Amino acid sequence: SNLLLQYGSFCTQLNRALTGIAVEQDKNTQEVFAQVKQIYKTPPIKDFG
Amino acid sequence: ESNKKFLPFQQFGRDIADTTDAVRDPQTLEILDITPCSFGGVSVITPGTNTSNQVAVLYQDVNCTEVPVAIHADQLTPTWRVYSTGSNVFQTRAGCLIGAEHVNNSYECDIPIGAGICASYQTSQSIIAYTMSLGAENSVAYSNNSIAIPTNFTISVTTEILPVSMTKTSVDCTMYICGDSTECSNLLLQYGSFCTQLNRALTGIAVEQDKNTQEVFAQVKQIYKTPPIKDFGGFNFSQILPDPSKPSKRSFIEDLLFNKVT
Amino acid sequence: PFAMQMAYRFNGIGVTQNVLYENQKLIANQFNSAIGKIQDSLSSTASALGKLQDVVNQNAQALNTLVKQLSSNFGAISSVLNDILSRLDPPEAEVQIDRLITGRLQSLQTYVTQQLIRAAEIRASANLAATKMSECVLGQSKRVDFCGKGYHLMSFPQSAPHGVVFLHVTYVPAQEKNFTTAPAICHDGKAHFPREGVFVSNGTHWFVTQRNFYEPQIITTDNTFVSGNCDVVIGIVNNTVYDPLQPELDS
Amino acid sequence: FNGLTVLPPLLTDEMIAQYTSALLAGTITSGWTFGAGAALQIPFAMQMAYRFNGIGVTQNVLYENQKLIANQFNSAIGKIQDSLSSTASALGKLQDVVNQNAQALNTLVKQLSSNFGAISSVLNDILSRLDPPEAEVQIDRLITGRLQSLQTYVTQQLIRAAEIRASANLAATKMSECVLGQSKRVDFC
Numbered sequence: 001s002n003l004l005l006q007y008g009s010f011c012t013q014l015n016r017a018l019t020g021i022a023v024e025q026d027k028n029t030q031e032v033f034a035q036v037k038q039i040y041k042t043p044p045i046k047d048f049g
Numbered sequence: 050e051s052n053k054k055f056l057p058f059q060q061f062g063r064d065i066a067d068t069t070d071a072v073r074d075p076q077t078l079e080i081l082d083i084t085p086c087s088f089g090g091v092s093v094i095t096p097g098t099n100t101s102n103q104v105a106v107l108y109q110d111v112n113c114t115e116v117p118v119a120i121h122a123d124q125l126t127p128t129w130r131v132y133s134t135g136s137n138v139f140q141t142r143a144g145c146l147i148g149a150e151h152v153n154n155s156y157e158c159d160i161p162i163g164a165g166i167c168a169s170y171q172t173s174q175s176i177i178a179y180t181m182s183l184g185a186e187n188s189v190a191y192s193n194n195s196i197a198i199p200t201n202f203t204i205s206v207t208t209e210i211l212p213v214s215m216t217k218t219s220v221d222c223t224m225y226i227c228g229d230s231t232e233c234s235n236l237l238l239q240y241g242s243f244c245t246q247l248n249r250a251l252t253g254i255a256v257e258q259d260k261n262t263q264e265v266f267a268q269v270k271q272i273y274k275t276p277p278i279k280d281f282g283g284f285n286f287s288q289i290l291p292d293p294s295k296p297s298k299r300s301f302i303e304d305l306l307f308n309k310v311t
Numbered sequence: 312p313f314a315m316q317m318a319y320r321f322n323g324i325g326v327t328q329n330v331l332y333e334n335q336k337l338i339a340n341q342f343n344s345a346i347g348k349i350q351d352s353l354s355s356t357a358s359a360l361g362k363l364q365d366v367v368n369q370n371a372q373a374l375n376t377l378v379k380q381l382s383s384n385f386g387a388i389s390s391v392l393n394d395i396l397s398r399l400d401p402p403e404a405e406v407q408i409d410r411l412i413t414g415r416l417q418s419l420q421t422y423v424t425q426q427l428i429r430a431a432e433i434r435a436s437a438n439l440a441a442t443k444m445s446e447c448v449l450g451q452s453k454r455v456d457f458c459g460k461g462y463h464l465m466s467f468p469q470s471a472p473h474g475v476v477f478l479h480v481t482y483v484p485a486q487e488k489n490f491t492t493a494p495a496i497c498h499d500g501k502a503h504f505p506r507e508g509v510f511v512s513n514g515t516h517w518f519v520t521q522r523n524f525y526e527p528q529i530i531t532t533d534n535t536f537v538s539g540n541c542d543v544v545i546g547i548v549n550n551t552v553y554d555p556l557q558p559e560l561d562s
Numbered sequence: 563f564n565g566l567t568v569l570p571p572l573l574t575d576e577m578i579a580q581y582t583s584a585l586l587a588g589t590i591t592s593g594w595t596f597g598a599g600a601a602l603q604i605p606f607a608m609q610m611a612y613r614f615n616g617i618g619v620t621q622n623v624l625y626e627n628q629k630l631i632a633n634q635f636n637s638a639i640g641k642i643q644d645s646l647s648s649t650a651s652a653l654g655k656l657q658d659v660v661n662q663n664a665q666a667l668n669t670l671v672k673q674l675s676s677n678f679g680a681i682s683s684v685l686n687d688i689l690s691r692l693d694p695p696e697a698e699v700q701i702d703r704l705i706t707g708r709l710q711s712l713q714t715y716v717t718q719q720l721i722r723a724a725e726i727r728a729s730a731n732l733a734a735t736k737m738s739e740c741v742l743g744q745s746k747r748v749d750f751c
């Protein structure tokens with residue numbers, strides 16, 4: 001680790017990049033699915049013609 | 050103790066990464082599985098410090114059977130001085146959350162925690178963690194002969210923001226690496242075109258940003274101008290049309306936008 | 312005239328234009344109030360522009376990292392080139408200097424690659440912005456929730472630092488009412504269907520109203536089109552369909 | 563367990579299933595009108611007549627054939643059932659994603675078994691065999707190599723994530739213009 005410290009921020013920007021990826025995936029699912037404000041429910045009876 | 054059946058001649062069971070994973074003990078010829086000591090990431094949940102200083106801590110993907118037996122004897126690389134464990138230690142799929150009070154109530158996400166757990170600063174103010182609510186439940190009064198028709202309307206002006214360009218940077222590779230050093234530059238010359246293709250890539254980026262703005266905005270051939278009189282049927286557009294009084298002909302909302310990003 | 316433009320774009324979302332003209336003052340006031348609300352929403356909420364702000368920060372941040380990478384030894388005796396130049400002869404200073412170049416080159420390549428990827432993302436965003444200006448400002452788009460939430464009416468662009476802001480004026484229906492509906496109506500054995508709109512009932516009489524704004528009109532042969540006969544439609548209801556010609560051809 | 567963690571997704575599969583149930587129930591009971599304002603109930607038959615009128619077919623076509631469309635829809639859903647439940651490759655596009663990520667991780671881990679020129683790929687081996695002045699060089703070669711491998715991994719992840727983001731933006735577009743409404747864009751839905 002002390003040897004690694006000589007490379008400066010080479011090792012923290014990787015963590016930052018991967019964190020960016022992960023939060024982006026949460027954003028992806030949010031965008032794709034959470035497009036409805038209210039949680040609807042179908043009525044008990046399935047009389048859809 | 051493990052069940053990896055070493056045959057009498059084998060000594061060091063090996064793992065994919067070529068780290069030893071089991072060992073036959075030299076004195077009693079018995080096998081031992083070697084599991085790395087429990088470790089994980091430590092994330093800190095904080096409402097913005099400009100609001101409060103009290104925080105919570107998430108030990109990621111760690112059963113907190115280990116977390117107390119580690120801290121109360123000071124087995125940590127964190128090595129806190131002011132650390133406190135409550136009775137509010139809580140367990141989630143994302144790990145063990147310490148310092149946030151589990152709440153039965155469910156609100157919208159404020160600080161994501163994962164596995165449907167979301168944390169927030171809420172009331173005596175305190176940090177709470179809950180299972181985020183997906184939105185208000187609403188059953189639709191559906192029937193096979195019933196239709197709901199609106200009798201009114203609303204002209205809603207939403208706003209939506211898109212990046213278009215980004216600062217056209219440019220790195221002078223040879224000066225960056227070899228600042229004003231003929232010796233270092235000569236050493237760099239042995240790497241060939243490693244240093245010119247970087248300049249080419251960044252130049253490509255910059256000209257592309259000019260292309261971006263061109264495409265987004267220059268979609269009109271002629272520069273139109275609104276007439277002097279604002280007789281648009283009662284609609285008020287002064288808020289978005291350019292104002293004559295300001296040095297760059299930017300409307301009021303454009304001014305607020307240019308005042309925020311800086 | 313802008314009023315007629317608005318009637319155009321009302322007709323473009325299934326609302327007959329008479330709705331606009333008879334409410335013109337009311338839409339005008341709602342539009343003006345909505346613009347004022349946008350004013351205040353900006354002028355108060357700082358995070359409203361996050362998407363642009365983030366971009367700036369990211370680039371700035373990267374540059375900072377790049378610069379900070381000039382203060383690392385990378386294994387060399389010192390992070391300052393001139394220091395080594397002034398302390399060692401070329402045969403030995405060569406190795407230190409080489410380690411510094413190898414490291415700084417690696418850092419620079421990393422920076423350029425992150426820039427390439429971020430620029431590709433920004434290009435995706437700018438292509439989407441160009442698409443929105445084309446189909447959203449220069450015209451009226453039928454693509455749901457692509458321009459705004461609600462039925463699209465129009466959109467106004469505004470500049471912003473390294474980005475664009477659209478004000479999406481959209482129509483959102485407000486105060487709904489239940490009615491008993493019916494797919495068709497048996498008048499004389501025939502089954503009249505809506506020409507445009509639905510059949511509704513306030514409990515006693517049957518009206519035909521347009522899709523999106525309850526305006527009930529007496530049912531007339533000019534409102535409906537005949538097809539088939541009674542016995543095939545599921546849910547058809549009896550009623551009488553007024554025909555305009557008979558009062559003239561009776562007087 | 564080399565520091566290679568997999569954080570859980572924010573929305574559990576349960577919450578996502580709740581979301582899709584919401585979108586389904588809205589689409590059925592209300593139509594496209596829940597994507598604009600508040601959901602407005604409407605008989606599903608009349609919804610289908612709406613969406614027939616939306617493709618140039620006068621709605622009387624629906625009402626007079628209602629049983630026949632109903633049967634074709636039900637049979638089509640059954641066919642989708644069987645097409646899934648038999649053909650394994652039907653989900654390739656998702657499966658591929660998983661494999662790719664998994665594969666990359668494996669490669670990353672395997673890269674810990676390479677000398678990169680060092681005397682050995684095991685750090686503690688060198689730590690237990692050489693004094694610092696000489697172990698420093700071996701260790702440095704290992705760091706240089708492992709760092710290069712890690713940077714390669716992160717860059718491939720960045721590019722793959724950009725591709726996935728493109729796909730998710732297209733998926734959001736399809737849910738907006740394709741579920742929440744009826745799209746006139748040919749062969750897009």
Ligand SMILES: *[C@@H]1O[C@H](CO)[C@@H](O[C@@H]2O[C@H](CO)[C@@H](O)[C@H](O)[C@H]2NC(C)=O)[C@H](O)[C@H]1NC(C)=O
Binds near residue numbers: 200201202337485
């Ligand atoms: C349609 O909605 C608008 C507002 O959404 C109504 O206009 C308001 O009417 C009330 C009277 O109860 C006034 O106090 C408000 O000042 C009006 N608002 C505006 C902006 O003018 C309108 O009455 C509704 N029309 C119907 C038929 O319900």
Ligand SMILES: *[C@@H]1O[C@H](CO)[C@@H](O[C@@H]2O[C@H](CO)[C@@H](O)[C@H](O)[C@H]2NC(C)=O)[C@H](O)[C@H]1NC(C)=O
Binds near residue numbers: 283284285287
């Ligand atoms: C359009 O709206 C603007 C405000 O956005 C109006 O300007 C205001 O005019 C009143 C007088 O009627 C002044 O008291 C305000 O100070 C003005 N505000 C600003 C920001 O200048 C403008 O008069 C409106 N015009 C029409 C035709 O409606």
Ligand SMILES: *[C@@H]1O[C@H](CO)[C@@H](O[C@@H]2O[C@H](CO)[C@@H](O)[C@H](O)[C@H]2NC(C)=O)[C@H](O)[C@H]1NC(C)=O
Binds near residue numbers: 513514516
């Ligand atoms: C349903 O609407 C119809 C027409 O709007 C109503 O019929 C009229 O009702 C008024 C009183 O509300 C009478 O003065 C008229 O003579 C009626 N017209 C006809 C042609 O009969 C009817 O009352 C409404 N019913 C309900 C329950 O709202």
Ligand SMILES: *[C@@H]1O[C@H](CO)[C@@H](O[C@@H]2O[C@H](CO)[C@@H](O)[C@H](O)[C@H]2NC(C)=O)[C@H](O)[C@H]1NC(C)=O
Binds near residue numbers: 497547548549
């Ligand atoms: C609509 O009116 C017709 C006739 O005006 C009704 O048809 C009658 O149906 C009953 C039940 O089968 C028969 O016994 C009668 O002979 C039919 N009359 C005629 C003239 O054929 C029909 O039922 C009415 N619809 C509703 C929903 O009441």
Ligand SMILES: *[C@@H]1O[C@H](CO)[C@@H](O)[C@H](O)[C@H]1NC(C)=O
Binds near residue numbers: 099100
């Ligand atoms: C942040 O705290 C400061 C006090 O230092 C206060 O001036 C400011 O209003 C706070 N910001 C918010 C958003 O509350």
Ligand SMILES: *[C@@H]1O[C@H](CO)[C@@H](O)[C@H](O)[C@H]1NC(C)=O
Binds near residue numbers: 112113114
């Ligand atoms: C944590 O350990 C307890 C037993 O000490 C066990 O019951 C529990 O399931 C564990 N949690 C997880 C997430 O495995």
Ligand SMILES: *[C@@H]1O[C@H](CO)[C@@H](O)[C@H](O)[C@H]1NC(C)=O
Binds near residue numbers: 151152153
């Ligand atoms: C939530 O309510 C249940 C009773 O339904 C109770 O047993 C539980 O302790 C509550 N949770 C918290 C965190 O108080």
Ligand SMILES: *[C@@H]1O[C@H](CO)[C@@H](O)[C@H](O)[C@H]1NC(C)=O
Binds near residue numbers: 190197488489
């Ligand atoms: C329509 O009727 C249902 C019946 O329960 C009711 O819940 C709903 O509020 C009604 N709609 C309106 C707009 O009043």
Ligand SMILES: *[C@@H]1O[C@H](CO)[C@@H](O)[C@H](O)[C@H]1NC(C)=O
Binds near residue numbers: 047193194545547
């Ligand atoms: C609606 O359902 C009821 C049963 O609740 C049934 O009596 C009626 O015939 C149905 N009508 C239509 C149009 O589906």
